[PDB]
Structures are given as C-alpha cells and as structure tokens.
C-alpha cells in the first residue's frame, strides 16, 4: 500500500544542542535539523528495499521540540534535559545508554503518538560514541524501533516506548561535520527500521575503500566521502524490507 509510506518522527533538541549547535538561536537549530532530516529522507526514499520498485519509503518530521533551557529537577531526580550529566556529573556527557533510556522514559507520552522519536544532543560521549538506537523488527510484538508498542518499565511504573534513538554532534571536543552528522542519524534510524550492523568477514556488505567503502550500517562512522557511505547494504535491505513490509500498515502515514 504505497500510501502509508512515511514514518513521521518527533525530533527533539535538548538544551545543549540549542546552545552549542544552534548557538542559542531558534532558527539556526530548527534549520539545522530540518536540513539534516531532509538529507536522511533523501537516502531512504530513493532506496529500493528489494532492488526493484519497493521504494519511496521515508522519514518526515511531524514536530520539532527545542528545549531552550535545561530542565529544572528537584534534588534526587533526573531528566534527559537537565543541566548536569548522569551518572557522573564531572563528565561532559551522560552515559550514552543511560541517556537514551531516560529520554525514552520522559518522552513516553509523546513518543506513543509517533512512528519514531529522536533526540539530538551535543555532548562528548566516551570513546567517540556518536549515537545509538533500539533495533526495529517485523515481529508482531516488537518493542523497539518503528511503531510505538508499549513496554512496561518495572522501575518506571509506567508504559514507555522504545521507538527511539539519539545523535550527538559533538566528539572529542569538536563539532562533527554535517556530512558525518547526517550519516550518524541515517544509521541510528536504520536500526529503528530493523537493520543490524553490516558484518565483516562476509564483507559483501562491508566493502573496502577500493570498492566504495562501507555502507551506512557499518558501526565505524569514519568519513562520508566514499560512494557506499550514503547507501544501505544488501544486508540492511533484506533486514529493513521485512520490517517495513510488516510495520508500515501499523504506523506509517502518507508523505508530505
């Protein structure tokens, strides 16, 4: 049903992104995200998941939430948009896995109404980690990835949705390039769409430079100049195709 071909996403910019990437300017933040998502959409929509005519599936922004200032929290409590990092304050960044969980927990209400939710931040996660996401799946009862399917958090005492992921544009005290940032998000949304990492050894899906380089689902971000960098491997295609063919009817909407 090439009608429901768009995964609408809730894009969230925390206060660090606003200040550090948007330089405290709303329009700058907004334009950076819209343009990034449009370039990610360009890759998706032109991808034929079956090497045939099964294309035109993409991502579009349903809403942008820009948190201009840090979230105020009563002592003892945490929030993904709070001034301090967690669990170790002294550091510039949160523990990456812990931040995604916190974001999922706090955005629950809003994430429940969209195909995907994505957090954009600006913090130097350890060992050069740029982002992460919950992997999607065609399994009728899949919790992570595309389409909200409530997961009950025992400690949270409420329903949270794992239709999320996050991108940071900061790394080793420096701002990454747009070309690199676009590929980080493509890759994280990629897990959301059901893809796993492109494997080596098999390397049909992880070509060497002299062949066009790695495809977007390779785990090492590195550059973005080689041709394959902006394309999904055959491994990701198979994987994503099943997920889409199963979940599109459940939460995808009409384009534009």
């Amino acid at each position: 049903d090439p009608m429901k071909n768009t995964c609408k996403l809730l894009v969230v910019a925390d206060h660090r992104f606003y200040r550090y990437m948007g330089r405290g300017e709303e329009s700058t933040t907004t334009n950076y995200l819209i343009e990034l998502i449009d370039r990610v959409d360009d890759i998706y929509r032109n991808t034929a998941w079956d090497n045939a005519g099964f294309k035109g599936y993409g991502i579009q922004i349903e809403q942008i939430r820009i948190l201009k200032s840090p979230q105020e929290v009563k002592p003892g409590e945490k929030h993904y948009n709070m001034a301090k990092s967690y669990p170790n304050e002294e550091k510039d960044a949160w523990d990456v896995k812990m931040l995604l969980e916190q974001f999922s927990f706090d955005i629950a209400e809003e994430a429940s109404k969209v195909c995907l939710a994505h957090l954009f931040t600006y913090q130097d996660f350890d060992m050069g980690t740029l982002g992460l996401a919950y992997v999607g799946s065609p399994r009728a009862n899949s919790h992570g990835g595309v389409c909200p399917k409530a997961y009950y958090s025992p400690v949270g005492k409420k329903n949270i949705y794992l239709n999320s992921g996050l991108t940071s544009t900061k790394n080793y005290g420096k701002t990454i390039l747009t070309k690199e940032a676009d590929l980080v998000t493509t890759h994280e949304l990629g897990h959301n769409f059901g893809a796993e990492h492109d494997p080596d050894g098999l390397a049909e899906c992880a070509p060497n430079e002299d062949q066009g380089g790695k495809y977007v689902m390779y785990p090492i971000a590195v550059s973005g100049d080689h041709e394959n960098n902006k394309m999904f491997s055959q491994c990701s295609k198979q994987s994503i195709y099943k997920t889409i063919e199963s979940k599109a009817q459940e939460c995808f909407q009409e384009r534009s």
Partner: protein, 121 residues
C-alpha cells in the same frame, strides 16, 4: 551504535582497564528491555588499571549491538581489551578499543609497549 575511531594512545589513557585477557570461559545473557551480556575471562597481563580494579574476571557489555553491545567469542583466541570501571565492574562497548591479539601487528604491539611512558600521568 556508531563510533568514531581515534588514537589508541589516547584510548589507552582514557580507559580504566587495558588487559590482554582470554575468553576461554564463556558468555552469559541476562533479562531486561533487550538484555545484558557478561563474559567470563581469564586475565593475563594487565597494562593498566592495577589501582582501580586490580585483576578483572568479569567483563560486562550490552547484549544488543545497536545499543553498543560488544561481540567477542568463547574459548577462542586472545584479545587486547579496554573498558571502564563502574560500581565494582568492568564494562566494554563496541566503541572501546578492542582487537584480536592475533591481528595486532608488530607495529601496534610496539606502540602498546610504549606503555612504559604511561603518559596518562
């Protein structure tokens, strides 16, 4: 999960632990959203982290690769592992410097030995 490689001399000092342990033991999976994994390894020559956690035995990682979980192998070859100490445990991730001691080139092991510098402090 996406990582940006960088310098190994920088990674060396940034990590709490740096060992050349083996995975002769095995891997154990746990419950949760997606899950956690815990590898049992026999340490050998520690190059860093004598203070923090002198001699490690259990290395923890996320079970899901998309969440930066680490993928090793049972009763196989040796690995040059790095990781961090948190709440009395060692956690390693896909973004952490990790390499099969086999693949480790003569050039690299030479730079590894340049631990004498201990730069860090």
């Amino acid at each position: 999960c996406t990582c940006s490689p960088s310098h190994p001399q920088d990674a060396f000092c940034n990590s709490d632990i740096v060992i050349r342990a083996k995975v002769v033991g095995k891997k154990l999976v746990k419950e949760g959203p997606f899950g956690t994994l815990v590898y049992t390894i026999k340490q050998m020559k520690m190059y860093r982290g004598f203070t923090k956690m002198p001699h490690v035995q259990y290395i923890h990682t996320e079970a899901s690769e998309s969440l930066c979980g680490l993928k090793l192998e049972v009763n196989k070859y040796q690995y040059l592992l790095t990781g961090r100490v948190y709440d009395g445990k060692m956690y390693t991730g896909l973004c952490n410097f990790v390499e099969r001691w086999d693949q480790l080139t003569l050039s690299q092991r030479k730079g590894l030995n340049y631990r004498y510098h201990l730069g860090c402090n």
